[PDB]
Design a protein around this ligand. Structure first.
Ligand SMILES: Nc1nc2c(ncn2[C@@H]2O[C@H](COP(=O)(O)OP(=O)(O)NP(=O)(O)O)[C@@H](O)[C@H]2O)c(=O)[nH]1
Ligand SMILES: [Mg+2]
Ligand SMILES: [Zn+2]
Lengths: 168, 300, 110
């Protein structure tokens, strides 16, 4: 089995941990526990290949920005997560992507744009906006909701497919 | 002098701070990082720091949905709090953490000290039982030095945490001290523990094995501060007995600190003022009075 | 609550040189507020409200190192660092029961 080191990044409160838990432990955390750095591992099959997923849950709090150089250095794929009811959250993805490119010294680093909290009825970032921003990046965009577990497998599996195309 | 910052520090009836609150809800989020620097330094220069903190902190708890949303994430008031910890507790953290850090690096570099407690990440030569002890020993003396540091806590922060203590107590009188201690550890103590070099405490980054242990120690220290057991990562559960015992020791330290400067750079406050001056009066006297000073003193 | 009596709260005046009521007769209670789960670690308090208007007149936080002087029956006073607080009881039976309550409260501090 091949190891795929995934990294979840985004602003604080977008649902990075809630999305990670629904993938690993298959249950929705209703609490808000701001993380520093959590690590997980899961074995799964994508497109017929069995593989291990090395998942890294990062700190959205801006005080822990000095840790970003290390996990961007060792990570292979990045799941850029934003919340659809926080326009700030949508625009923060830029500064994460620019630092990933700078430490990788590359313009093509595999990553996926994820718009979380799709269960809410009020959204400040509609779908066509995030689709156009993803086209600017050249990366896929997937709508997810850690509450109802919508698109959580799709978001993580798609990031894996981006790493496969990059390795070839 | 023709430079009147009074308008900014003007207080309405019931202490409204009309100019700052209107400036807080219209300035772009990019400049929030320096708006907190401008307002904190200005109000502190005129002995109105408590009035600024009382107004901005009240707005946060007011609009916060629940106690777990309180001061989590990055908003302007969250920037103001971290700035006050920064400019007033830098010397406090520096002289407190530097001795313990130099004991961890200069000393104990003799042995193969490893704090790796994740089994799937552990080298075959190293031992899990031994590394688990190494982490708890380091975490113990670090935690003891913080709890015993009450007599060295600077007064400006003690005023910030108490101001934070009272404002939340108006809506959540039960266990309001918990919110102070978590934000205290999450936004001030732990970020400097994880990255001592970037915080200005050390001259260079510690060795890679120490950096892994400091990161794991701050995860434990945060669990103690949040008064919550480890429930996510299975390899942090072995420390639940350690964090369950030190719950109320930190709670006593939080109850302690929560109970009762040369202004520099010649801030181009008017440069900040007029750039976001457009449509300040979107509300619902000073804006009319402000326009005369802005028209006479043209933007630079 | 751990105990519940009706007594007059006392405060030592440094200008007067003796103990004086804080102005009313109060119902003094000893209770705990759980930190998290009800059957878990908690904080302990002494609280007294005047009977006429249910207005709080004394609120303490019990500590393990707290000294509790029982110089005479129906009169107890203690110390919370800078400030000094006291109580005078209407009967020794009420004073003894209130002492038993805070004695077990400190035993449950942990
Ligand atoms: N309605 C709804 N709420 C969600 C969803 N995902 C997360 N939340 C809520 O978002 C809050 C924060 O979630 P969390 O996963 O801790 O966010 P985070 O990205 O981990 N924050 P941090 O960066 O500090 O770790 C919690 O209240 C959680 O319940 C979602 O899909 N729908
Ligand atoms: Mg998280
Ligand atoms: Zn407790």
């Amino acid at each position: 089995m091949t190891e795929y080191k995934l990294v979840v990044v985004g602003a604080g409160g977008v649902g990075k941990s809630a999305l990670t838990i629904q993938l690993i432990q298959n249950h929705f955390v209703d609490e808000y526990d701001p993380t520093i750095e959590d690590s997980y591992r899961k074995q799964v099959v994508i497109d017929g290949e069995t593989c291990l997923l090395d998942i890294l849950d990062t700190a959205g709090q801006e005080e822990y920005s000095a840790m970003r150089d290390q996990y961007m250095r060792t990570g292979e794929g990045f799941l850029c997560v934003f919340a659809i009811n926080n326009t700030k959250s949508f625009e923060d993805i830029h500064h994460y992507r620019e630092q990933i490119k700078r430490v990788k010294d590359s313009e093509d680093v595999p990553m996926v744009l994820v718009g979380n909290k799709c269960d809410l009825p009020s959204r400040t970032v509609d779908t066509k906006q995030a689709q156009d921003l993803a086209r600017s990046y050249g990366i896929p965009f997937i709508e997810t909701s850690a509450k109802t577990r919508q698109g959580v497998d799709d978001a993580f599996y798609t990031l894996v497919r981006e790493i496969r195309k990059h390795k070839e | 002098f023709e430079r009147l910052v009074e308008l900014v520090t003007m207080m309405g009836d019931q202490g409204e701070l009309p100019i700052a609150m209107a400036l807080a809800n219209v300035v772009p989020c990019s400049q929030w990082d320096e708006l907190a620097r401008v307002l904190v330094t200005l109000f502190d220069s005129r002995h109105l720091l408590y009035q600024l903190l009382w107004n901005m902190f009240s707005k946060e708890v007011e609009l916060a949905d629940s106690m777990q949303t309180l001061f989590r994430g990055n908003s302007l008031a969250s920037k103001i709090m971290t700035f006050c910890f920064k400019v007033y507790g830098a010397t406090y953290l520096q002289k407190l953490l530097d001795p313990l850090l130099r004991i961890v690096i200069t000393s104990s570099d003799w042995q193969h000290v490893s704090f790796e407690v994740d089994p799937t990440r552990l080298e075959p030569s190293e031992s899990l039982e031994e590394n688990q002890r190494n982490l708890l020993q380091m975490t113990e003396k670090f935690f003891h030095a913080i709890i015993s540091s009450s007599s060295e806590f600077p007064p400006q922060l003690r005023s910030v945490c108490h101001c934070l203590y009272q404002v939340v107590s108006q809506r959540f009188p039960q266990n309001s001290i918990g919110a102070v201690g978590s934000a205290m550890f999450l936004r001030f103590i732990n970020p400097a523990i994880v990255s001592p070099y970037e915080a200005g405490i050390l001259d260079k980054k510690p060795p890679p094995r120490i950096e892994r242990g400091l990161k794991l120690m701050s995860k434990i220290l945060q669990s103690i501060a949040n008064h919550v057991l480890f429930t996510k990562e299975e390899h942090m559960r072995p420390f639940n007995d350690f964090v369950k015992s030190n719950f109320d020791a930190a709670r006593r330290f939080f109850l302690d600190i929560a109970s009762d400067i040369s202004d520099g750079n010649v801030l181009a406050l008017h440069r900040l003022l007029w750039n976001n001056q457009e449509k300040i009066g979107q509300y619902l006297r000073p804006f009319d009075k402000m326009a005369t000073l802005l028209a006479y003193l043209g933007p630079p | 609550s751990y105990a519940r009596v009706r007594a007059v709260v006392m405060t030592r005046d440094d200008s007067s040189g003796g103990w004086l009521p804080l102005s009313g007769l109060s119902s003094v209670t000893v209770f705990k507020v759980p930190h998290q789960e009800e059957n878990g670690c908690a904080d302990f308090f002494i609280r007294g409200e005047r009977l006429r208007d249910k207005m709080v007149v004394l609120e303490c936080m019990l500590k393990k190192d707290l000294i509790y002087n029982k110089v005479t029956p129906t009169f107890h006073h203690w110390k919370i660092d800078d400030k000094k607080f006291g109580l005078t009881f209407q009967s020794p039976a009420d004073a003894r029961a209130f002492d038993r309550g805070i004695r077990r409260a400190i035993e449950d501090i942990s």
